[PDB]
């Protein structure tokens, strides 16, 4: 739930996976979290760190 204050969760793979198994990289109903920012100076005037 967007993490607790003093959480320190540096996990990887998939968040609790779910009812769907790993299935190699992701499978059907899965994705890989921890994606790089890649923010651009023009894509979002307020959407940038």
């Amino acid at each position: 739930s967007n993490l607790k204050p003093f959480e320190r969760d540096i996990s990887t793979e998939i968040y609790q996976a779910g009812s769907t198994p790993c299935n190699g990289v992701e499978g059907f109903n899965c994705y890989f979290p921890l994606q790089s920012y890649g923010f651009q100076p023009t894509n979002g005037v307020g959407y940038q760190p």
Partner: nanobody
Framework: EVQLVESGGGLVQPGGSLRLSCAAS????????MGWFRQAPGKEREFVAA????????AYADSVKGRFTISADNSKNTAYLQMNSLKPEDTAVYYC??????????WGQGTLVTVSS
């Protein structure tokens, strides 16, 4: 019933390129589990590529890195898959899925894609 419409599949020369397009008839307009799967003759249906609906993110299998590109949009409610330098082994019928939230899988009909001279 969740009807999936597929187009663009057909015969292509080796090393060629096509433009697949699979649209969805709404499907609650919210799903986080779609992907592209093909079933080669005499082979079990494996994973090829996928795309996330919550963003413009892309994801591909290890064997289709770079050569295959997938792009989706919210206004037209579809996803265009572009192939490059198709191999003879790539000859298989693709399938586009749509996994509704808290619901089982949804599958379409697919189109035959033949890669031969």
């Amino acid at each position: 019933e969740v009807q999936l419409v597929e187009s663009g599949g057909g015969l292509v020369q080796p090393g060629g390129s096509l433009r697949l397009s699979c649209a969805a008839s709404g499907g609650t307009f919210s799903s986080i589990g779609m992907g592209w799967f093909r079933q080669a003759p005499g082979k079990e249906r494996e994973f090829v590529a996928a795309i996330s609906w919550d963003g413009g993110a892309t994801a591909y299998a290890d064997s289709v890195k770079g050569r295959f590109t997938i792009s989706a949009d919210n206004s037209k409610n579809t996803a265009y898959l572009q192939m490059n330098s198709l191999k003879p082994e790539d000859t298989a019928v693709y399938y586009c899925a749509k996994e509704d939230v808290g619901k089982p899988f949804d599958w379409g009909q697919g189109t035959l894609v033949t890669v031969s001279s």
